[PDB]
């Protein structure tokens, strides 16, 4: 989405990245919450083979939570850094 | 354009959906159930009585 | 387990699709739903296949 | 009725196959009919044709 | 296209509340991404520490 933004308009790197991130916020949060609650029974599962389900769900939820917390913020910064490096190559 | 064609044809996409669903029903009805994939080595036992 | 986790994957693509169609309809006036769907799909086609 | 408790019946050949038939053939046939209906509907772009 | 209504309106209060919460979250996320973009060295170092 950021690359399309840079193609469609002459937005500088900061604005392209941030506008792409704000556009993307809604879908990503939908998916994150959706299968957050999807795996919530798994981490709280009880009964036959409970330990296996707990073990799987714990990692699932933790990895997703950190993704939604850090990676969404970080990816625009990495796009910005890569485009700046590309500008350095042009010079 | 391939996506566009299906939009022009709701019934065609629906039929694809029902065909996929029915194939899934058949697949699940025929497929056996395992606790885990059996990676254990096959065994052959020889028994003798004296 | 892979399938009851894949439920997350399957909903994602439809979610992005429908969200983009919703944005096209609500943001732009005098757009029929079919054309909005085709517009969003031509915009988002390369992403999903990627 | 005629036999006592000790006697136990058994079947062979065509009779055995008929007795042990799972009946999946009829379900397969009706699903083939359903497939025919769906294929016709797809080309004709109608749910009644 | 078959099962969408253009220009959805008359939302319920609770979903509006969540939508307002979502908008506040979007604004906070925009400010966060802003300070993430403005400063790069610190958060790159944080990522390496990570």
**d(C-alpha C24, C-alpha C39), whole Å:** 8
Experimental method: cryo-EM
Specify the resolution in Å: 3.4
Give residue for tokens 């169609």: C21
Helices C2-27 and A13-43 cross at an angle (nearest 10°) of 140
Which residue, among A26, A4, A25, A28, has the nearest Cα to A16 in the 3D structure? A4
Those residues of chain E whose CB sits closer than 8 Å to some CB in chain B are: 1-2
Query: Nearest C-alpha of chain D: how many angstroms from B6?
Result: 11
CB atoms near residue C44 (< 10 Å): 19
**d(C-alpha E11, C-alpha C22), whole Å:** 15
Q: What proportions of chain A, in percent to the nearest 5, are helix, strand and coil?
A: 85, 0, 15
**d(C-alpha C16, C-alpha C11), whole Å:** 9
The answer to whether residues A76 and A9 touch, using CB atoms and an 8 Å cutoff, is: no
**d(C-alpha B48, C-alpha E23), whole Å:** 78
The three-state secondary structure class of A29 is: helix
Query: Nearest C-alpha of chain B: how many angstroms from D9?
Result: 31
**d(C-alpha A76, C-alpha A16), whole Å:** 9
DSSP secondary structure string, C9-50? HHHHHHHHHHHHHHHHHHHSSS--HHHHHHHHHHHHHHHHH-
Task: Give Cα separations from A23 to A2, A13, A20, B23 (angstroms).
Answer: 9, 15, 5, 38
**Measured between beta carbons, which residues in chain B are less than 8 angstroms from residue E2?**
10
The answer to whether residues C5 and A39 touch, using CB atoms and an 8 Å cutoff, is: yes
Which residue, among E48, C1, E15, E38, has the nearest Cα to A41 in the 3D structure? C1
**d(C-alpha A11, C-alpha D32), whole Å:** 57
Among chain A residues, CA nearest to C47: A1
Q: Is C37 on the interface with E (CB under 8 A)?
A: yes
Task: Give Cα separations from C38 to C16, C20, E25 (angstroms).
Answer: 14, 11, 30
Which residue, among E6, A88, A80, A67, has the nearest Cα to C31 in the 3D structure? E6
**d(C-alpha E47, C-alpha E50), whole Å:** 5
Task: Give Cα separations from B32 to B28, B38, D24 (angstroms).
Answer: 8, 13, 17
């Amino acid at each position: 989405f950021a690359m399309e933004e840079r193609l469609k308009k002459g937005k500088s790197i900061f604005e392209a990245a941030i506008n792409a991130a704000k556009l993307r916020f809604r879908p990503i949060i939908m998916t994150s919450l959706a299968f957050t609650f999807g795996v919530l029974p798994m981490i709280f599962a009880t009964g036959a083979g409970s330990a296996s389900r707990h073990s799987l769900g714990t990692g699932l939820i933790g990895g997703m939570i950190a993704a939604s917390t850090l990676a969404i913020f970080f990816v625009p910064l990495f796009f910005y850094l890569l485009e700046n490096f590309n500008e350095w190559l042009d010079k | 354009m391939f996506s566009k064609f299906f939009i022009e044809r709701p019934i065609f996409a629906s039929v694809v959906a029902i065909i996929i669903s029915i194939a899934g029903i058949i697949g699940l009805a025929n497929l056996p159930v395992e606790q885990y994939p059996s990676l254990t080595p096959p065994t052959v036992q020889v028994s003798a009585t004296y | 387990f892979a399938l009851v986790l894949a439920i997350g994957i399957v909903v994602d693509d439809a979610i992005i699709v429908v969200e983009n169609i919703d944005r096209i309809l609500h943001e732009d006036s005098n757009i029929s739903v079919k054309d909005a769907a085709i517009k969003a799909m031509n915009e988002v086609s390369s992403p999903v296949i990627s | 009725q005629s036999l006592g408790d000790e006697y136990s019946i058994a079947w062979s050949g065509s009779a055995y196959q008929e007795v042990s038939s799972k009946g999946a053939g009829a379900y397969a046939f009706v699903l083939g009919m359903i497939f025919v209906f769906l294929i016709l509907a797809a080309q004709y772009e109608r749910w009644l044709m | 296209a078959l099962f969408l209504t253009r220009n959805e309106s008359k939302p319920f209060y609770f979903i509006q509340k969540f939508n307002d919460f979502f908008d506040w979250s979007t604004s906070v996320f925009s400010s966060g991404v802003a300070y993430i973009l403005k400063r790069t060295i610190r958060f790159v170092l944080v990522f390496c520490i990570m």
